[PDB]
Design a protein around this ligand. Structure first.
Ligand SMILES: [Zn+2]
Ligand SMILES: [Zn+2]
Ligand SMILES: [Zn+2]
Ligand SMILES: [Zn+2]
Ligand SMILES: [Zn+2]
Ligand SMILES: [Zn+2]
Ligand SMILES: [Zn+2]
Ligand SMILES: [Zn+2]
Ligand SMILES: [Zn+2]
Ligand SMILES: [Zn+2]
Lengths: 149, 150
């Protein structure tokens, strides 16, 4: 039966482990089964980085109905704007409930989840030559933004 | 648990900029930009239908239209993954309302505990602890993660 709307639930089959989300935490070591869940992929991929996991998922999706299930759902989330691609390394990033800001696990770029784009310009933190420019001229990057760092 | 925050919903009118924050006791969003009523349980605009009629009509349209079937097959995935459930009383598909651990069904008005994916109460409604998740009975939450299932 899982857990709260505020929680991530472990992906080990039938595991009762769960956690809350935190802006600067992208992995969850389940205290029940001890497997490391990646919160951006919503998957356990302990032998791979996220790009390797997602490229392998697309490969398995050609001859596996359950992987094809997963990938075609991601395609719809991407189109609906529920997920996004990292603007730097282009992995698929899925939402962490209540987090307006994400640091990519693969390339470490800061992502403004509210606007579905980079937080900063190419110079990184403090570079408002690009990115969402939250609170430049006092204006939030979107009226719904509470804290995109 | 987590730092209390507000969770946004975006209007389903194509390319509309309207948006709102989710609230426990609000299941409909009247967009202030386009004035269309969004149902926050179906995540769709179905102003001439109740939610059961909308979901039944969507399943019908799935057999011939491409977009309707990717919508319905996504819901079936969401059901197995646990990002959605069926109302324990009237059995419509209920999608997660971000930041809400309690939901009052739009069709039958049954209170739903999202945390346990089931009824909040027994058959007698509020206060009936003969069924439901029994949250806070003897000071014990219905699940350690529960943030407020009323
Ligand atoms: Zn686990
Ligand atoms: Zn990952
Ligand atoms: Zn990246
Ligand atoms: Zn931002
Ligand atoms: Zn912002
Ligand atoms: Zn609108
Ligand atoms: Zn509805
Ligand atoms: Zn119902
Ligand atoms: Zn409950
Ligand atoms: Zn509860």
């Amino acid at each position: 039966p899982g857990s709260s709307a505020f929680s991530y639930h472990c992906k080990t089959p039938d595991c009762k482990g769960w956690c809350f989300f935190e802006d600067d935490v992208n992995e969850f070591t389940c205290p029940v089964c001890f497997h490391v869940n990646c919160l951006l992929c919503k998957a356990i991929h302990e032998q791979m980085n996220c790009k390797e996991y997602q490229e392998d998922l697309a490969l398995r999706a050609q001859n596996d109905v359950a992987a094809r299930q997963t990938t075609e759902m991601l395609k719809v989330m991407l189109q609906q704007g529920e997920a996004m691609r990292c603007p730097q390394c282009q992995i698929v990033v899925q939402k962490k409930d209540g987090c307006d800001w994400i640091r990519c696990t693969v390339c470490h770029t800061e992502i403004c989840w509210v606007t579905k784009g980079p937080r900063w310009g190419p110079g990184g933190p403090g570079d408002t030559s690009g990115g969402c420019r939250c609170r430049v001229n006092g204006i939030p990057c979107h009226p719904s933004c509470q804290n995109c760092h």
